[PDB]
Amino acid sequence: QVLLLPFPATNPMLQFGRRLAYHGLRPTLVTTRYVLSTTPPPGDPFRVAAISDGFDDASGMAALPDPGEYLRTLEAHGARTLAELLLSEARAGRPARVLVYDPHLPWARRVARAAGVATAAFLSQPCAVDLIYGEVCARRLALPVTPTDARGLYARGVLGVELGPDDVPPFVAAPELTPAFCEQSIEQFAGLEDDDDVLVNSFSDLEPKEAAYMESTWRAKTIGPSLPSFYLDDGRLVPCMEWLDKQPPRSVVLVSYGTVSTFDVAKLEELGNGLCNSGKPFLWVVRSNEEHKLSVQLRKKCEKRGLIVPFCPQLEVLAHKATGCFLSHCGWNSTLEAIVNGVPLVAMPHWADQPTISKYVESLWGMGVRVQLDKSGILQREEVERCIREVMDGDRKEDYRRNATRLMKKAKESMQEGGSSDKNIAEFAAKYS
Ligand SMILES: O=c1ccn([C@@H]2O[C@H](COP(=O)(O)OP(=O)(O)O)[C@@H](O)[C@H]2O)c(=O)[nH]1
Numbered sequence: 001q002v003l004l005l006p007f008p009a010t011n012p013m014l015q016f017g018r019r020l021a022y023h024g025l026r027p028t029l030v031t032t033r034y035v036l037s038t039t040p041p042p043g044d045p046f047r048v049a050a051i052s053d054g055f056d057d058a059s060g061m062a063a064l065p066d067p068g069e070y071l072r073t074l075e076a077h078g079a080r081t082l083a084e085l086l087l088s089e090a091r092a093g094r095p096a097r098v099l100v101y102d103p104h105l106p107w108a109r110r111v112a113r114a115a116g117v118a119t120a121a122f123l124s125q126p127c128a129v130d131l132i133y134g135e136v137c138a139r140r141l142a143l144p145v146t147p148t149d150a151r152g153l154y155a156r157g158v159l160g161v162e163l164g165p166d167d168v169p170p171f172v173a174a175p176e177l178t179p180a181f182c183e184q185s186i187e188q189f190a191g192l193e194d195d196d197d198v199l200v201n202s203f204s205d206l207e208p209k210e211a212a213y214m215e216s217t218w219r220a221k222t223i224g225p226s227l228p229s230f231y232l233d234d235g236r237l238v239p240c241m242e243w244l245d246k247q248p249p250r251s252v253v254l255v256s257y258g259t260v261s262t263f264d265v266a267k268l269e270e271l272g273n274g275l276c277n278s279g280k281p282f283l284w285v286v287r288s289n290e291e292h293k294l295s296v297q298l299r300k301k302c303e304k305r306g307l308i309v310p311f312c313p314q315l316e317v318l319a320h321k322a323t324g325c326f327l328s329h330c331g332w333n334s335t336l337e338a339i340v341n342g343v344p345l346v347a348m349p350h351w352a353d354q355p356t357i358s359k360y361v362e363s364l365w366g367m368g369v370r371v372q373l374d375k376s377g378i379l380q381r382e383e384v385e386r387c388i389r390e391v392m393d394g395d396r397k398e399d400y401r402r403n404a405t406r407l408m409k410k411a412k413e414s415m416q417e418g419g420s421s422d423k424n425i426a427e428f429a430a431k432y433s
């Protein structure tokens, strides 16, 4: 038995689990009783097992808004029900050979360690961000992290790009803005020198200096991109689509800004007018509440070339031949999905890993551009238009496509039989089988 403990609510861990099963391990997804009550189980090859966060009949994420507070409930109950799961499973003849866990849950580690269960930390943020947090946790870097700090890592051949003030990860560049996430980001690495394995959802051709440093400093092994095999061309394992089928090749701007507060739906009006003014066909994901908040006049303007939808099969949209670029907040999973499909990016980072990923996208990978905010931090329609035309029509357009395609090929190769990430996956599985 391999146990998989992602933060409760995933895909990347489960995809790693699917490859463990291919090599003959038996994976179990471990999640809350709530998730398990409500959501359907992953199905074969997975079993599921349930712990508790204190909240078996209601989301405690809702019931406890503050960051610090939810975590303590989850820990208190989770640590205890996890301990019982392990002991139960052991007594049941199904002892856990290894616990793969999100190190945003460092108590997973102590529970497993206490029961003699090997631990494998699963980092699903890019090496470049993980390493900065690590350096802070090891006290080789002092809060706050500054562009100067970053330029030192760059000079030392650890970071492949020079990060400015809008590129450093804000959780440690501006700790005071978000102290709980700051702490948690850094703490992932306290006690990670004790893990039997450390795994990162990236690939080494993507971030070669950063992945080499993570490997030599934390023994981190790249196991990504951890996505469904189909999209990596690996054979060993709806209205918007009908709309995409009618579009010309490489023409559509996929757009996912993410969640917007009431404090700004002016933002969405800027975004939507920018889209209309670009003149490109566009598929814009806006959740239904937020759509009802758009102006009548913006909705009519969007009818001409756009389709607004509450959700889409993002990976399938990105693989469709109609899709020409992705205006994204540049979350990591989203970004790897774009890479693997060879889609240029227009990056609108908000937080967490996004600023740093966006800098990589623009300045090392060369697969798109990042939107420039004004003095007040606002994204204007003119900037949205400009970025779209820059990627889809400008003089550098073929550079963005060529670079994305280059990264798509190395992504696929890394995960195919015999690639760098596939080898790390196979070594990990031979270790526990
Ligand atoms: O309409 C949507 C919005 C998101 N996702 C998926 O949800 C995951 C994470 O979404 P988010 O947009 O927060 O991006 P991340 O921040 O994880 O990169 C990714 O695998 C997306 O493919 C999707 O399939 N359809």
Ligand SMILES: CC1=C[C@@H]2O[C@@H]3[C@H](O)C[C@](C)([C@@]2(CO)[C@H](O)C1=O)[C@]31CO1
Pocket (backbone or CB within 6 Å): 007, 067, 070, 071, 104, 181, 184, 352
């Ligand atoms: C309670 C809680 C929710 C968080 O949301 C943001 C993001 O959506 C994922 C997470 C990593 C996040 C979930 O992992 C964080 O770890 C956390 O502790 C977070 C800090 O970056």
